[PDB]
Design an enzyme around this catalytic site. Structure first.
Site, PDB file in Angstrom:
ATOM      1  CG  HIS B  74      -0.194   1.801  -4.977  1.00  0.00           C
ATOM      2  ND1 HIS B  74      -0.750   2.493  -6.099  1.00  0.00           N
ATOM      3  CD2 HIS B  74       1.054   2.287  -5.019  1.00  0.00           C
ATOM      4  CE1 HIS B  74       0.162   3.278  -6.408  1.00  0.00           C
ATOM      5  NE2 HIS B  74       1.391   3.080  -5.884  1.00  0.00           N
ATOM      6  CG  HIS B  78       3.823  -1.927  -4.887  1.00  0.00           C
ATOM      7  ND1 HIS B  78       4.695  -1.623  -5.750  1.00  0.00           N
ATOM      8  CD2 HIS B  78       3.699  -0.807  -4.013  1.00  0.00           C
ATOM      9  CE1 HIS B  78       5.391  -0.374  -5.805  1.00  0.00           C
ATOM     10  NE2 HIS B  78       4.842   0.088  -4.636  1.00  0.00           N
ATOM     11  CG  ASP B 113       2.524   2.205  -1.394  1.00  0.00           C
ATOM     12  OD1 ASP B 113       2.449   3.168  -1.095  1.00  0.00           O
ATOM     13  OD2 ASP B 113       2.916   1.508  -2.464  1.00  0.00           O
TER      14      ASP B 113
HETATM   15 ZN   LIG Z   1       4.801   2.015  -3.598  1.00  0.00          ZN
HETATM   16 ZN   LIG Z   2       3.289   5.001  -2.019  1.00  0.00          ZN
END
Ligand SMILES: [Zn+2]
Ligand SMILES: [Zn+2]
Ligand SMILES: COc1nc2cccnc2n1-c1ccc(Nc2ccc(C)cn2)cc1
Ligand SMILES: COc1nc2cccnc2n1-c1ccc(Nc2ccc(C)cn2)cc1
Ligand SMILES: COc1nc2cccnc2n1-c1ccc(Nc2ccc(C)cn2)cc1
Ligand SMILES: [Zn+2]
Ligand SMILES: [Zn+2]
Ligand SMILES: [Zn+2]
Ligand SMILES: [Zn+2]
Lengths: 318, 318, 318
Positions: B74, B78, B113
């Site tokens: 993450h 990403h 994220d």
């Molecule tokens: Zn994600």
């Molecule tokens: Zn997420």
């Protein structure tokens, strides 16, 4: 004055290091913050304590350090290691080289892999990286020299500011050729030329172009000096090299390209044979020719031979 | 003026990247410092070169980057990867979306994220992390949106400063819903609703609540696009995901809680079957429904199917 | 005033943490940014909310954090963990210790491994590191105390600025002795003396030199508290310890010295027996003697015993 105070100074390492740093197979150790002092020490013994202004030299060193990346092999430790091998070559052939060459080559070695990302010229080309459009040959090596020049151009970083313009240009050219020579693709032709010049007796260090070639072979020898350490150091360092190469193999596969066995982690079991190939085709000839030209560099070849034996032993299952 | 100079500008990637970035299964590569330019390029083709002030956009991008952490999955890579999948969806359904939606969703993806620690909502709850007291549902996702708003509020970071207040509120709401939709726990109900609306023909993109659901499914599809790359990329990325999950499994065990097989490194050997389960229960239905709704996104489903076949092949020992 | 506002304040952790932090086997969790608050909380319950000026304490904490390195075991997490074990010892023997001792020992624990490089005193000596020339015994431990003093001397970092000079000297001495006692080479003699004083009944906490010894044994017990956690935490932490030791073994081999089995990664398979040896020869006697002297620390010994059983179980193949 300041140069006068600098002239009274002594620089010194611990006792064990003063003794063993003269050895070709010296390992610079795991303490990162000792590495700048080790390099200054080498510069002071090989060049003289008045070649560089100390405050400037240290500023330069820490900036160079800052511009190496955190990759497994082509990192700051590699740079200082390659610099040490050049130190040992220079100290054991101490009547042959000028002051400019001594200064230059030590600096070239320290900077030779600046801003290395852990990928070969080949991968950059296939990825179609912007550096490959800018530098059609020796892509990374011309980048390392460009990085070197950028750092020198920084305020308070011109460690050669005391040289005349003529000497400055000469040293930068020594540095440029030496860094470009670290492109291994250029090695094969270079060693081939040197061997033939050596055998016929045309090889003459008073000829600038021959001299450039010999320095180039010196850079290859320093660049590859991993294979000239004692076995425990050589075998552990091999871990670092393959970590980088296998990562590149992964990236090749992501581009849809089958990587060669050298870069392919699926071929781990065949590493020992791959090393054997490398020693036979590249390293032994490298240090053999260099020993012919510079007999005092013979310990590099001996050590290389011992490691070749160790890899054969691995293959046998011994 | 400045917007006029910006209007004359062109942004361009190397040749290979200009061509293959249009592909759904494009991989953004290992060169981190190329990623901001890749994102700017996508924004300029999909939104227009005058949607954002370039200096502001770059400032924003580097701050977002700075607020992703160094976790195995993450991470910043990403984020840009999820943004690329949204780019490809937008470009292949280019008549359906407004300017605000285009701007918004690309930004939402880049920020989706933010400040991820590499732990699920579940672990936070069991650890009794302060975020879990503040956000009872979609804990991490409401944090990512809060982080997004904090970055926008920074001086010189409001990339939407040219919008009217009304448009600003709309885009922030588009961003908020899109980030919350990346909570996979919400996916199952969302896809279920979309499937049924699709089958009966009630599904209508002119209805805001239906439109929100479709965007939500789009976010899931981008968020999971790992399973839609070519096999070498998909299989290597799987390494990164399990590195994170297994670390969480370790932390579960430290709390005295037996983690589920997904998070348990003791169950490595059963990964291939676990992936098979994931493709059957989550990924294939996801891209199947999305392909029904947006037929041009079909290559995601094809690629997902190919990877499902590859995992079956692993299970067989083939 | 400021001390008055600070007196009205409450500091509080999430519910689960308030409850379980009182347990000897508490794990401080994977969220790094929660660790400073955990430490402040412990200081406030064990010492009082007026022992330190909060802004100063936090400044000090973040500087200490900044001076721990990114090594696998002797890192910032280890420091806070060792501090927690001392917290639990202090809270369960709360009538025995002065305010200065409470303040001091918590601070000593937090600072006990400052600037640890992940190498033992032995390796430094063999490498001939500059610290070994400066500190002939307890090399790293005298460095940690020197680091501690440097941080205190920083502007706005003297967390003891409110103490009288006499009290300041006392607390610094408490800190100095406690950090030096973490040199495990000194433990063996210390425990031996304490055991014999305990058995004959000469041991008396009103005698300063006996008191110093008991605190020293406390520091050993906190320093080793890895072996007193629940099995899943103990077994995972063991991974971290050997990562460090094996790296040192590698470096020994690079110096041309065969490392002992403890530091040799070639001896992995013999770890379980090596742990068994460690528990028998060092850990069990440590917590046994400490439990004799301070009966409320008995849960450390119980937990140590349970882990000894687990390692025996590993050896059996059970
Ligand atoms: Zn994600
Ligand atoms: Zn997420
Ligand atoms: C420039 O390449 C290398 N530099 C090295 C320095 C130390 C040790 N090895 C080095 N190598 C290197 C050279 C050749 C190989 N070849 C192969 C081929 C196949 C396989 C399976 C493994 N290695 C590897 C590294
Ligand atoms: C959200 O979870 C996942 N996201 C993924 C993206 C790419 C690949 N896998 C992803 N996963 C994921 C989903 C399910 C599992 N399940 C299991 C179950 C048991 C075992 C032994 C392994 N995996 C894992 C990852
Ligand atoms: C100070 O040394 C240790 N501190 C520890 C904390 C937790 C767990 N182990 C710790 N150790 C430690 C002590 C002894 C050994 N001994 C050996 C000997 C041989 C082999 C093959 C492995 N370990 C290791 C770690
Ligand atoms: Zn190079
Ligand atoms: Zn190199
Ligand atoms: Zn220590
Ligand atoms: Zn310690």
């Amino acid at each position: 004055t300041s140069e006068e105070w600098q002239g009274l100074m002594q620089f010194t390492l611990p006792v064990r290091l003063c003794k063993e740093i003269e050895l070709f197979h010296f390992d610079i150790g795991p303490f990162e913050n000792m590495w700048p002092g080790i390099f200054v020490y080498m510069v002071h013994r090989s060049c003289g304590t008045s070649c560089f202004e100390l405050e400037k030299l240290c500023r330069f060193i820490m900036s160079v350090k800052k511009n190496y990346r955190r990759v497994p092999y082509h990192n700051w430790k590699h740079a200082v290691t390659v610099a040490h091998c050049m130190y040992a070559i220079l100290q054991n052939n101490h009547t042959l080289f000028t002051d400019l060459e001594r200064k230059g080559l030590l600096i070239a070695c320290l900077c030779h892999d600046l801003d290395h990302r852990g990928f070969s010229n080949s991968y950059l080309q296939k990825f179609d990286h912007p550096l490959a459009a800018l530098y059609s040959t020796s892509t990374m090596e011309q980048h390392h020299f460009s990085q070197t020049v950028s750092i020198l151009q920084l305020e308070g970083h011109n460690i050669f500011s005391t040289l005349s313009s003529s000497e400055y240009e000469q040293v930068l050219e020594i540095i440029r050729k030496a860094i470009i020579a670290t492109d291994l693709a250029l090695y094969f032709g270079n060693r081939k030329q040197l061997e033939e010049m050596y055998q016929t007796g045309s090889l003459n260090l008073n000829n600038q172009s021959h001299r450039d070639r010999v320095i180039g072979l010196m850079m290859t020898a320093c660049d590859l000096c991993s294979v000239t350490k004692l076995w425990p150091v050589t075998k552990l360092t091999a871990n670092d090299i393959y970590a980088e190469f296998w990562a590149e193999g992964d990236e090749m596969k992501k581009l849809g390209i089958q990587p060669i066995p050298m870069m392919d982690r699926d071929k781990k079991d065949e590493v020992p044979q791959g090393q054997l190939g490398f020693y036979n085709a590249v390293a032994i000839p490298c240090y053999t020719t260099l020993t012919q030209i510079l007999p005092p560099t013979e310990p590099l070849l001996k050590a290389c031979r011992d490691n070749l034996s160790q890899w054969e032993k691995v293959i046998r299952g011994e």
